[PDB]
Amino acid sequence: DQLLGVLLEKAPPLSLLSPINKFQPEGHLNRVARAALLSDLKRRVCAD
Amino acid sequence: TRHAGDFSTVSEQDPRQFPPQGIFFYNKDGILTQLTLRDAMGTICHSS
Amino acid sequence: MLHDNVTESLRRITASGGRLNPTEPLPIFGGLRPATSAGIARGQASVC
Amino acid sequence: EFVAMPVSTDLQYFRTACNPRGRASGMLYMGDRDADIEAIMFDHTQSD
């Protein structure tokens, strides 16, 4: 059941990331905006 | 001051007697940095 | 201005601070601007 | 591990807790260009 764990291995963290990709229609932002979004995501993950 | 029991510091080099050479502020989360020389250097020697 | 030997030193001193400055040949004509450098996740700089 | 640093430590750097691999690098302050050469990875020619 788990000896051949090729198909039974999928743990993508998306619960805290789904809104951040749903809000953006395209996501083509600048470097400052990308860095701010990354810092906000890191802070949210730390304070979860 | 009305009394010395409110806020008294026993320090020979009291900062009160020295003139204020800069301002104190908190950047975003509260990063205490004395960032005054960089924005106060300027030129102020030609246009005036 | 005729004191080139001191104006060059003043320009070097004011360029060693790390702010924006023209190129080595001193392009006083045209619209030449310094290349944009990398920046930390702190926001956007502005004049004062 | 043993790290040798001057006694004039920076509390702001510890509070921010950025990347300790020398100068700041990585795809965090850019993304609008394909390549940016080693000048963004390690230059040590301008301000941090």
- Residues in B closer than 8 angstroms to C19, CB to CB, are 38
- Dump strand ranges (E) for chain A: none
Element (H, E) at A39: helix A31-46
Contact D30, C38 (CB under 8 A): yes
Task: Tell me the C-alpha distance between D48 and D36, whole Å.
Answer: 17
Experimental method: cryo-EM
| Closest approach of D2 to chain B, Cα-based (Å) | 27
> Which 3-42 residues of chain B touch chain D by CB within 8 A?
31-33
* Alpha carbon distances (Å) from D23 to A20, A40, D47: 29, 22, 10
Task: Tell me the C-alpha distance between A39 and A23, whole Å.
Answer: 17
Q: Which of B19, B21, B23 is nearest to B32 (CA)?
A: B23
- Which are the contacts of B26, defined by CB distance < 8 A and separation ≥ 6? B32
DSSP readout, D1-48? Answer: ------SS--HHHHHHT---SSS--STTS--SSS---TTTTS--SS--
Task: Tell me the C-alpha distance between A37 and A43, whole Å.
Answer: 10
Q: Which of B44, B25, B47 is nearest to B36 (CA)?
A: B25
